[PDB]
């Protein structure tokens, strides 16, 4: 389940996303809000939509390319959210009242066998009530989640600056070094270290939003102090909205 599509869509426009794979649904979450169902579509092509959104929602599927599509028209800032591609299991369950029995459980397989019967066998032509339905739906698997920002502002790639350790900022055997990712738009920025080989002691912080309308964050790693003079540390900044990837080597200060 791979969410693909723009991270930025302008107001009034129709957001359009795709989920490559190889019963699919869509869920989203706006900041500080609960999960919000959107819709799904099974192998038979039938579709279901959140009643409050089915006006603007449109979901398709290409069993050929194994690609499900979501189309949300006339988007507003209210549609700013993380959009999750999911897999759904749906199974309606039928039960009879206490005592009452299914026709097929009494031994009858003619017409009406799937209904409930108060009088079993005993002249089965008896009182017949439809079985009670209990619906079971849950998401099996979740996608990673694509962040969609809705705004008129223009994309801007980040400027990366080094957060270098110095002789007085060490902590004995350990030392902190990082990268400052400044003035980008929209979110998100992903940061790795040494192309994913360096994962321990790494922490990437949530971004701040400046009065300029632009974002900034920092990523830091605690490394051994002894290795600093010769070890190579590179932060890998990726900003898919601008298709910008920046690798910056962080050297320790000469003081």
């Amino acid at each position: 389940l791979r969410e693909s599509g723009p991270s930025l869509v302008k107001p009034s426009q129709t957001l359009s996303l795709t989920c490559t794979t190889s019963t699919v649904g869509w869920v989203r979450q706006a900041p500080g809000k609960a999960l919000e169902w959107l819709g799904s579509i099974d192998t038979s092509g039938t579709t279901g939509y959140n009643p409050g959104l089915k006006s603007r929602l449109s979901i398709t599927r290409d069993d050929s390319k194994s690609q499900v599509s979501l189309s949300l028209s006339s988007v507003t800032t209210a549609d700013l959210a993380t959009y999750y591609c999911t897999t759904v299991r749906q199974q309606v369950h039928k039960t009879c009242p206490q005592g009452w029995r299914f026709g097929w459980d009494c031994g009858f397989h003619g017409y009406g066998s799937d209904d409930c019967y108060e009088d079993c066998i005993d002249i089965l032509s008896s009182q017949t009530l439809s079985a009670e339905d209990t619906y079971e739906l849950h998401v099996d698997a979740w996608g990673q989640g694509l962040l969609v920002t809705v705004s008129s502002a223009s994309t801007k790639g980040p400027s990366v600056f080094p957060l270098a350790p110095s002789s007085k900022s060490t902590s004995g055997g350990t030392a902190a070094l990082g990268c400052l990712v400044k003035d980008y738009f929209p979110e998100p920025v992903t940061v790795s270290w040494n192309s994913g080989a360096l994962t321990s002691g790494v922490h990437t912080f949530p971004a701040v939003l400046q009065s300029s309308g632009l974002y900034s964050l920092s990523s830091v790693v605690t490394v051994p102090s002894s290795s600093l003079g010769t070890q190579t540390y590179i932060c890998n900044v990726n900003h898919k909205p601008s298709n910008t990837k920046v690798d910056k080597k962080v050297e320790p200060k000469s003081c």
Binding site: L35, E36, Y49, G52, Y135, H138, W142, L180, F205, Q210
Partner: protein, 214 residues
């Protein structure tokens, strides 16, 4: 528009048991599933069909029902369980489901930890780009409650400051960040800048001076 209401916040002690309730809008016609959302990760399905566990879900996660009220119980609370939990249910043959209001679970009794504070002055590269950002990084503290103040020559500074809310690191301890955005001229117009981090009756202050190399 079925209303599944959860307590916005619930707290339990490490190793003990806790319950997150999911009550209906008022004939519970659908089964309840539960989901775990840890920031930076995609949601994780815990329980489905009121009481059945999903794949890879430990045994301490258990679900139960009592007529329009579903309960998620975590029998042996762990620190990695601090997260947001959402119930959900489909109320009809519609291929649609509704999610609960959500619960943020707090795990108390974790080991307290004083914050480490790292203060980076503006890089020579950023200063040569005609900008100056002081970066105060706060790491490895519990509980996740800090206030951050900036000082210029011991005089408080409130403008050009941005701070992030504490969030969990990979080791279940918290971290926060704060920035002071200045002009290169302002950076040199003082003899020192401080980042002051208060945490549980303790204040850690780190200082940088434009006249001394970090």
């Amino acid at each position: 528009q079925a209303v599944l209401n959860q307590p916005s916040s619930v707290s339990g002690s490490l190793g003990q048991r806790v319950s997150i309730t999911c009550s209906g809008s008022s004939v519970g016609n659908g089964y309840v599933s539960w989901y775990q959302l840890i920031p930076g990760s995609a949601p994780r399905t815990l329980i489905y069909g009121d009481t059945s566990r999903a794949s890879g879900v430990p045994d301490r996660f258990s679900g139960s029902r009592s007529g329009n009220t579903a309960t998620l119980t975590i029998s042996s609370l762990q620190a990695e369980d601090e997260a947001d939990y959402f119930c959900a249910s489909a109320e009809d043959s519609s291929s649609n489901a509704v999610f609960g209001s959500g619960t943020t679970l707090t795990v108390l009794g974790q080991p307290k930890a004083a914050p480490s504070v790292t203060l980076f002055p503006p890089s020579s590269e950023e200063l040569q780009a005609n900008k100056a950002t002081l970066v105060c990084l706060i790491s490895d503290f519990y509980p996740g409650a800090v206030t951050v103040a900036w000082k210029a020559d011991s005089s408080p500074v409130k403008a050009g400051v941005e701070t992030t809310t504490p969030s969990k690191q990979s080791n279940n301890k918290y971290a926060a960040s704060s920035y002071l955005s200045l002009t290169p001229e302002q950076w040199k117009s003082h003899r020192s800048y401080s980042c002051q981090v208060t945490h549980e009756g303790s204040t850690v202050e780190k200082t940088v001076a434009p006249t001394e190399c970090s």
